[PDB]
């Protein structure tokens, strides 16, 4: 109906006006007085050399020592990052895998991809082998991200426009989130696991409520698909990485963009995004085979992490902030300290 | 300078790498094909000749083939088409009898043009199957080809129309030097449809081997 369209456009205008009114001073002009961090140099401490194809995802354990990586050769590998040992190697039923996760307690891992199914594996069994514990079906598109809430809950985002919160004990969708108009490509859990954000292919991001399920606020400003998202350690901000060669910082309380991280010599899209322990540096992986470290408060390139011969697809930072691991479309992972 | 447990862990790790190497060597000896179509082209009968992705395995002349059918993935093609960069060849199915209406031939042409000229599929050759040819002869006998192709000047004979369709499909590739297109008339015939695939894949493998040498 025309009345619905008029009401929607009026509400959009009012939201834009309120957002403009709530802005009083840019973050950069406030911050400029602080001391810059200067050059940041990181050396490849370790190189993990097991896979045989492109690496699409990785995750860190909560003990900052064990990590899991997934590649398109149909293998899940758990590494001891201190000594580069292979603790486990899990063969997948389907070789087209685009996501990976590690349980907070260390008992389980998760997987998923083009087969529209999330698989849960039991690492600590009395039989001495790793076996699949539950297969969660019900998505009508490929799986793009998954994150554990605890040993019995998990939240997944798919390319079928929707997100869902599962229940591994029974395998049923407890809640479903439906407000996007394109594929959902990324996910990020809040520190207290009460909210989470999603980055979709309609160049927008939304903030959900896990307990009951509904979109609280939506944040716009990008120009193309959002490929990565991550929460600020404070839990009151997040950063997105899209395909127009830019990264942005949004704040929940103000409900407004804060800063933009772009440069003229970069024209390729961003594949992954993560912060540092104090929230001062913002790391981002690019398609030009480099990872760029950004002064998150001044949008200045502090450093560059150039050691990969192909596109960097995954990127994570340990829980104690002591190391950062990158994977790329060659079969190697690297640890930078 | 390692304790007993550390030495045992290193031994277990090394066994893991040995198994991974064996699995990779086994997997490298296989032919991976990607099957594409316009939904009603006849990929089903092609599969008969030999919820997400669908896989099909078959063997011909001591060679192992793997065919991946992406037909139920109704999402953005740009977001997962780079997974298949590296397949040996792409099998494209188009029905010669699907020029009636509901346009369908033009949709097939658009899909072929988009897939053929892609960043990832710059070197992967294409095997084209123009199936349902008896229906095509029946349709030609009654209706002329000018409905789908208004700018056509030739006799209403099966051979001429089939050659015109093949040429109009084959002239859609811009990189006429890095890529090759093999065309076949399926008709739901006997097996040549696997012999033709075997020949095309052998040519692709010979060219890849010559590239690996350095002469190309």
């Amino acid at each position, epitope marked *: 109906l025309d009345q619905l369209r008029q009401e929607a456009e009026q509400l959009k205008n009012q939201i834009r006006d309120a957002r403009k009114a709530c802005a009083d001073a840019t973050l950069s002009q406030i911050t400029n007085n602080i001391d810059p961090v200067g050059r940041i140099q990181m050396r490849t401490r370790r190189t993990l050399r097991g896979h045989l194809a492109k690496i699409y995802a990785m995750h860190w354990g909560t003990d900052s020592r064990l990590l899991v990586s997934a590649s398109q050769d149909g293998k899940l590998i758990i590494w001891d990052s201190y000594t580069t040992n292979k603790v486990h190697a899990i063969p997948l039923r389907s070789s087209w895998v685009m996501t990976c996760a590690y349980a907070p307690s260390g008992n389980y891992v998760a997987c998923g991809g083009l087969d529209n199914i999330c698989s849960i594996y039991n690492l600590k069994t009395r039989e001495g082998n790793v076996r699949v514990s539950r297969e969660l079906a019900g998505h009508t598109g490929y799986l793009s991200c998954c994150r554990f809430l605890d040993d019995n809950q998990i939240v997944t985002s798919s390319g079928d426009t929707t997100c869902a919160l599962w229940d591994i004990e029974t395998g049923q969708q407890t809640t479903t989130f439906t407000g996007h108009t394109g594929d959902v490509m990324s996910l990020s859990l809040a520190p207290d696991t009460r909210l989470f954000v999603s980055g979709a292919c309609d160049a927008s991001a939304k903030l959900w409520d896990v307990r009951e399920g509904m979109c609280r606020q939506t944040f716009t400003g990008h120009e193309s698909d959002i490929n990565a998202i991550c929460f600020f350690p404070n839990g009151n901000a997040f950063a997105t990485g899209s395909d127009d060669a830019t990264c942005r910082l949004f704040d929940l309380r103000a409900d407004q963009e804060l800063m933009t991280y772009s440069h003229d010599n970069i024209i390729c899209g961003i594949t992954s995004v993560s912060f540092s322990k104090s929230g001062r540096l913002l790391l981002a992986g690019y398609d030009d085979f480099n990872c760029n470290v950004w002064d998150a408060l001044k949008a200045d390139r502090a450093g560059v992490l150039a050691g990969h011969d192909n596109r960097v697809s995954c990127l994570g930072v340990t829980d104690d902030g002591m190391a950062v691991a990158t994977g790329s479309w060659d079969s190697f992972l690297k640890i930078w300290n | 300078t390692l304790s007993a447990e*550390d030495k045992a862990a290193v*031994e277990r790790s090394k066994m893991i790498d040995r198994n991974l190497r064996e699995d990779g060597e086994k997997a490298a000896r296989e032919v991976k094909l990607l099957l594409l179509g316009a939904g009603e082209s006849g990929k089903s009968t092609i599969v008969k000749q030999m919820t997400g992705i669908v896989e099909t395995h078959f063997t011909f002349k001591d060679l192992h083939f793997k065919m991946f059918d992406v037909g139920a993935q109704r999402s953005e093609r740009k977001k997962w088409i780079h997974c298949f960069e590296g397949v040996t060849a792409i099998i494209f199915c188009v029905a010669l009898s699907d020029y009636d209406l509901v346009n369908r031939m033009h949709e097939s042409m658009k899909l072929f043009d988009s897939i053929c000229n892609n960043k990832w599929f710059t070197d992967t050759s294409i095997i084209l199957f123009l199936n349902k040819k008896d229906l095509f002869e029946e349709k030609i006998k009654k209706s002329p080809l000018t409905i789908c192709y208004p700018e056509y000047a030739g006799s209403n004979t099966y051979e001429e129309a089939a050659a015109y369709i093949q040429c109009q499909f084959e002239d859609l590739n811009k990189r006429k030097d890095t890529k090759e297109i093999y065309t076949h008339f399926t008709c739901s015939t006997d097996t040549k449809n696997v012999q033709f695939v075997f020949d095309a894949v052998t040519d692709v493998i010979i060219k890849n081997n010559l590239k690996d040498c350095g002469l190309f």
Partner: single-chain antibody, 233 residues
Framework: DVQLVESGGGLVQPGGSRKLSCSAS????????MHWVRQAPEKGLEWVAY????????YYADTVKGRFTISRDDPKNTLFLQMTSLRSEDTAMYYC??????????????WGQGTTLTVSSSDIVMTQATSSVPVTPGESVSISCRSS???????????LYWFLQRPGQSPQLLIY???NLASGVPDRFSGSGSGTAFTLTISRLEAEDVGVYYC?????????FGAGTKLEL
């Protein structure tokens, strides 16, 4: 069911050539390193031989080196100990312990049933001091075990293990690496201590906790066992 069944032991003449078979059913036998542990009647445990996963590493005890031979058959899920030229010092009950080694694993968790055999008539030293102490239900007691060399390693691990043997049964793991509780063990057990001075406490003791308590070392082969403190009353 992770049971292990051992058979082939019995009365032997001196200089015999008896061999024992250990059959496994209920776990991935190919990925577990298997030990052989004996026990003289009026004595304590004593490690004998070890064979790794993939059969790439084999270690023996000085007492039986050159006289006992160990082997495994992965497809048949059997563990062999072929021994030749027996003597009167080998009369003991033999166990078939299993162990898997990766980062965070718990070796020496499941112990076999024991097959008795009777024969016709730079090593770390662990001292357990006390050999008997009476206890009462509802009380808390502590057991001490001392090592000749510092078990603490340069990577921070203190390789010390605790075992409990109920009367007429097989020992079961309690603590591994001096602090970690074994799976299924009640929480009333706790372990602590530093290099060359270790202490296991049992707070709020109750029944089914009596028996003999041992300590072991996994820093370097040959592995050694303590004398054992018997808990009664």
């Amino acid at each position: 069911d992770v049971q292990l069944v051992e058979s082939g032991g019995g009365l032997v003449q001196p200089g015999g050539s008896r061999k024992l078979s250990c059959s496994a059913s209920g776990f991935a036998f190919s990925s577990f390193g298997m030990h052989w542990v004996r026990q003289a009647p009026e004595k304590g445990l004593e490690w004998v031989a070890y064979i790794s996963s993939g059969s790439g590493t084999i270690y023996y005890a000085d007492t039986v080196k050159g006289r006992f031979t160990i082997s495994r058959d992965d497809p048949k899920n059997t563990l062999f100990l072929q021994m030749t030229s027996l003597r009167s010092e080998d009369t003991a009950m033999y166990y078939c312990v299993r162990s898997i080694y990766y980062y965070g694993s718990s070796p020496f968790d499941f112990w076999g049933q024991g097959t008795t055999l009777t024969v016709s008539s730079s090593d770390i030293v662990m001292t357990q001091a006390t050999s008997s102490v009476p206890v009462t239900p509802g009380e808390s007691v502590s057991i001490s075990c001392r090592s000749s060399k510092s078990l603490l390693h340069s990577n921070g691990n203190t390789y010390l293990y605790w075992f409990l043997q109920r009367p007429g049964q097989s020992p079961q793991l309690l603590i591994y690496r001096m602090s970690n509780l074994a799976s299924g063990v009640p929480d009333r057990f706790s372990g602590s201590g530093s290099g060359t001075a270790f202490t296991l406490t049992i707070s709020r003791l109750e029944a089914e906790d009596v028996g003999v308590y041992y300590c072991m070392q996994h820093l370097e082969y040959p592995l050694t066992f303590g004398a054992g403190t018997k808990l009664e009353l």
